[PDB]
Amino acid sequence: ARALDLLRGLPRVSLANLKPNPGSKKPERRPRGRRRGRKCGRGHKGERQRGTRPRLGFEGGQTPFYIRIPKYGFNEGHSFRRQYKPLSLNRLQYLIDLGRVDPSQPIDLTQLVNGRGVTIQPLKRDYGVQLVEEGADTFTAKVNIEVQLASELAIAAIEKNGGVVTTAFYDPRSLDIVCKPVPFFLRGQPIPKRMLPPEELVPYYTDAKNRGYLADPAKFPEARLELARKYGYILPDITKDELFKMLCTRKDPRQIFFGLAPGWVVNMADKKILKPTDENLLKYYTS
């Protein structure tokens, strides 16, 4: 390149030639000299020059603005409100097209996080991912995706394209484990059993219309037919699909990972899985 040719022409680059990019290093202003000295920009007497002006929000003794406004429960229980990261069908299709999410295998929160399609923060009260109808019109991938919340239109698009969608609950601990399994495996603890949804969320995940993971499977075909009739598409018979087994694969309600069972210990150092055999431990981990 011309720049490299100019380098060849120019002297050697050393530690005596380095210079910061102009504009990156603002000059430091210090109170010496006529312009920046004398009162040093602090004003004249009063509190401001003495550096003792009242706290922020103080209005000189008048009832402050942030205190004369009545208290209202805008943020009550904010730290207890569940949050679900949105996953638009546009984003899902983008990920599938770029190969960061493989639709030939069951898609869940672990796969989404691994493909970097979503960023979950369980410490920030995130409870998982919610499917979003955005991009439904242009969504064409056939996928078996498991999420936490799902809109009616998103479910309709997934099912119209021949895929399967199920809403699965994850309590914060299981959510963190599934989002970041490798750190959990390095913790050395046995895989815990996923906890059931709280009483308030139980109806959502036991309702077939939401494709809840605890809902009666016998009611799923009626709900799928209702959505197909509502949105004017023919319900594809997935049982005849070559990927029917993959589409049908769903993890057990008390299971975090598809193959691994609660109570197992993943020894990553030597590529092994220790399975407890004590009857009491097995009963507890199957409970």
């Binding site: 495996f185 390095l186 913790r187 050395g188 603890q189 046995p190 906890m195 059931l196 009483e199 139980v202 109806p203 036991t206 605890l214 109570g263 210990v265 993943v266 020894n267 990553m268 150092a269 030597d270 092994k272 220790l274 407890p276 004590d278 009491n280 431990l281 507890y284 409970s287």
Partner: protein, 87 residues
């Protein structure tokens, strides 16, 4: 000159002496042993059986679950009675 050998992580598990007073307490509990097992495999030298709860710990966990996490049937019954009362 020749550079000093590159710094490297102390290979294998590190087991501080419990007798030493200066060893931090978090390096002596079972959590440290579990972490060492996870990181270094069988080379940790810790019995894998210790990873799972001891029977008393299992009893405590089961009691806590019974106390705080109700079963699906109990949740459904509570929801049903609440809905009936509201109606």
């Amino acid at each position: 000159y020749r550079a000093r050998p590159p710094p490297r992580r102390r290979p294998g598990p590190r087991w501080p002496d419990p007798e030493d007073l200066l060893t931090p307490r978090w390096q002596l509990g079972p959590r440290y042993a579990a972490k060492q097992f996870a990181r270094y495999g069988a080379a940790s030298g810790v019995v894998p059986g210790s990873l799972w709860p001891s029977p008393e710990q299992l009893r405590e966990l089961e009691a806590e679950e019974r106390e705080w996490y109700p079963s699906l049937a109990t949740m459904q019954e509570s929801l049903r009675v609440k809905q009936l009362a509201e109606e």
